[PDB]
Structure 1
């Protein structure tokens, strides 16, 4: 395949880019790194920022999950119709990243003591994305414009993992709730989300969700 994903055996920060690749009908190789292999240290020392994912597109080696998303967005035409839309796509993705960082901090560093406060704060964190949908064709299409973007896949993943963390959290957000259902029903993505290579990976690496 032209693409290789090098990552731990979790969904994590590769979930969105995998959904993107699958929904776009692209082929890729998964190179699985166990935490054991990672402890040996040689792969880690060779990674630019000491972390995974690592991604290959031919001889182009990338690190940083959002760099991979933007690269696929640019090369597959999932980055808006013009410069204005591209900026709005970035604005969405940066918002998704901010909330993802808070989610990851909760999962890996403070789950038991922090979950109540996190869930309490969650509606205020989701509301900006509902607002964005409400300002774009009544929320009937995508997060920006009338074609899918890499930010849709990232936002979709963020919403899916938050439904596991806080079941019912989208009940207060009709546009986000319908958006999750609509994107999840896209045939190639629906098949991917139902497949063992997605279903049989945990969301995170520490057993919490």
Structure 2
């Protein structure tokens, strides 16, 4: 059986970037799907350390927290920069991706109809930093840090794909980010994974707003 198991709701949500990573790296994992019905029963929730999913198992190591799982796969699969400085910059990127992710989630779950217009107007300023980091790394021709893919590329890639669904063309003002998403999306194992039913057939978020 594969050493990896992902336990989560049948949505892309906080597991889309970790699944893209495993698929692009050629690793197998098993999905254990939890329906909203099983979750309301209550017993699996009370068993989760912070009362939430995802849950991930690597052999007998059980982890919670989506970013902990990305960093763990980052360090075991050698996707964490080539030295100490790169690793610090990969973290700095992931943390800026997590802050925009939090704001995204908050909109979808609490203010979609009344805040979409204001969130969209303010998007370009939130996206500029990643355009700027790409500008300074080999003129935006490789990955977000150094010249080897890292876990933060998969998380940043997912964050841009969902915003392009929320605000179509929102990357039009950003040439390096635009080429970056097309370059990454065409990696053979990732392209195949992104066109497969296992990915396309799951909603982005749990309430079906996107």
Superposition TM-score, scaled by structure 2 size:
0.99
For each residue in 1:93-134, what CA deviation from the matched residue of structure 2 results, as whole angstroms up to 9, or x when unmatched? Answer: 000000000000000111000100000000000000000000
Between the aligned partners of 1:120 and 1:170, the Cα distance in structure 2 is 13
Between the aligned partners of 2:109 and 2:178, the Cα distance in structure 1 is 27
Query: Shift of the alpha carbon at 1:161?
Result: 0.2
Task: Please report the RMSD computed on the Cα atoms of aligned residues, expressed in angstroms.
Answer: 0.3
Query: Shift of the alpha carbon at 1:58?
Result: 0.1
Between the aligned partners of 1:129 and 1:47, the Cα distance in structure 2 is 33
Between the aligned partners of 1:108 and 1:95, the Cα distance in structure 2 is 20
Query: Shift of the alpha carbon at 1:136?
Result: 0.1
Between the aligned partners of 1:169 and 1:127, the Cα distance in structure 2 is 11
Q: How many residues align?
A: 209
Superposition TM-score, scaled by structure 1 size:
1.00
Between the aligned partners of 2:124 and 2:38, the Cα distance in structure 1 is 39
Uncovered stretches (5+) of structure 2, i.e. residues with no partner: none
Please name the residue that 2:4 is paired with. 3
Between the aligned partners of 2:45 and 2:111, the Cα distance in structure 1 is 25
SS in 2 for 1:43: coil
SS in 2 for 1:45: coil
Query: Shift of the alpha carbon at 1:83?
Result: 0.3
For each residue in 1:61-104, what CA deviation from the matched residue of structure 2 results, as whole angstroms up to 9, or x when unmatched? Answer: 00000000000000000000000000000000000000000000
Q: Which ranges of 4 or more aligned residues in structure 1 deviate by more than 6 Å?
A: none
SS in 1 for 2:172: helix
Please name the residue that 1:124 is paired with. 125
For each residue in 1:154-178, what CA deviation from the matched residue of structure 2 results, as whole angstroms up to 9, or x when unmatched? Answer: 0000000000000000000000000
Uncovered stretches (5+) of structure 1, i.e. residues with no partner: none
Between the aligned partners of 1:207 and 1:93, the Cα distance in structure 2 is 25
